[PDB]
Design a protein around this nucleic acid. Structure first.
Ligand SMILES: [Mg+2]
Ligand SMILES: [Mg+2]
Ligand SMILES: [Mg+2]
Ligand SMILES: [Mg+2]
Length: 112
RNA sequence: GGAGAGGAGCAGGCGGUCGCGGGGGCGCACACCUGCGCUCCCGAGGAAAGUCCGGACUCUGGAGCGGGGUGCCGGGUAACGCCCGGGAGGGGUGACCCUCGGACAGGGCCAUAGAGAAGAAGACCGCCCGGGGGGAAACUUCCGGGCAAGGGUGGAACGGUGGGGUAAGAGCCCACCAGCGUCGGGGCAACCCGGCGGCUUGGCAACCCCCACCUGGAGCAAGGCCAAGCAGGGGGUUGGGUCGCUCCCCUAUUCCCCCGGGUUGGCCGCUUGAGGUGUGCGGUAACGCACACCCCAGAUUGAUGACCGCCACAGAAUCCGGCUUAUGCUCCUCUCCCGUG
RNA sequence: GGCCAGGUAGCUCAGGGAGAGCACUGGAUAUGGGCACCCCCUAAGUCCAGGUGUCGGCGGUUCGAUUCCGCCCCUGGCCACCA
């Protein structure tokens, strides 16, 4: 859903500068009110996370978590998900349910 | 069965619940441009990779030189540093694998060790002859002369080993060998086979070089178009005109250089191509030709996931040909070895 | 996707027969300290002695390669339109 896909080239700077942030050991989540009746997701994966296979797997998991849990995630925010060094350190050791739990714990705390 | 060499294919599938990317069809709104909404088709790789070669395709005004690349020979190909076949040299019992022009065109470099390393250089331990001296002798000593043959030195010592011949010795002579020169035969050829002959005189060109062949340079962020927006200023014996050098066609601010500020939108390029698959024919093969069938990702923060059930390596970004590296199986050949019918 | 750089003692940097600087380990000795000397402790310093390496890895050429020729690994940077 590309209507659900927020542009990062223009908006990342604005969200970084004007928005809020939440984090845990695996993710940093940046967010800002978008003035819409729905939320939009963006993913920023640092080059150092790895090659296409690895980065694309992470992005797919993130997109899926967001899509399936859209109903419970707060509405009216532009959201940027950023994986942390730790995650890229035990990514192969971290299962899907753990990534889901850790990401949702942050997403559900987006206020207000 | 064991050990090993060459090579071909596949990339866990099939049946379920949700979620994407591009086409098509449809539902509709269309006073235009177009704007959404919901089924059929297709949707990462053998390496998509590293960017090591070769193209195609774009933009830079000409030509020459330099520079760079390839390196036995013959094909194949759009082309290549690739592929196929063949020739020499080497390794392995063997199937097989690896190597590749020229050092009497020239210049330069060979440390250390060693008597001597490029004109033929050299006498270290030595071998033999002719005298003078000492000494009973063995032996020592001095001068004159002859050896590259043994040993030592090396990565290599100016042909190799055996016999004859030498005072002692040398291709001095002869044998087989290696090299070179020729004559003759077979190959398109690289080269091979046979005969004759003095006696022959380092290595490195992944150093410059010589010979033969090929070759501008950038690169899809190439380049073309639309929309949007701010703000200009300082320079040019001229400089710049898609690497350098040399001659040459230009152009004078609108061009180029520096500082500063505006976008950090959308469309084209963007996928049908030296393209796959299936036969038939030619060719040792690589591959070519003929006919038939097919449409096989085109994203632009960048599309393939999660749950269930019987059994790796890693993700296209302009597209192809090949190389190299990363990696899980399965099958087909042939070689040697133990053991049996 | 493409195009360039660079990888040397721990760190910064030189350059076809492996070095400087900071630095570390010792010995010397207070004008520091146990008290005041004797005796002894500690070395910021100052003397001196050195300690030391797959040349980013793995092959090839060469009798020898930091230098030459291949590939692989790691670390940085550059690109688009407007005027
Ligand atoms: Mg059996
Ligand atoms: Mg690539
Ligand atoms: Mg000799
Ligand atoms: Mg440009």
């Amino acid at each position: 859903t590309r209507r659900e896909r927020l542009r990062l080239r223009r908006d990342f700077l604005l969200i970084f500068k004007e928005g809020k942030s939440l984090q845990n050991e695996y993710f940093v989540v940046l967010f800002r009110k978008n003035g819409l009746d729905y939320s939009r997701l963006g993913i920023v994966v640092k080059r150092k996370f790895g090659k296409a296979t690895r980065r694309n797997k992470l992005k797919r998991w993130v997109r899926e978590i967001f899509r399936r849990n859209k109903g419970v995630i707060p509405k009216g925010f532009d959201i940027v998900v950023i994986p942390r060094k730790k995650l890229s350190e035990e990514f192969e050791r971290v299962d899907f349910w753990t990534v889901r739990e850790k990401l949702l714990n942050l997403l559900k705390r987006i206020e207000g």
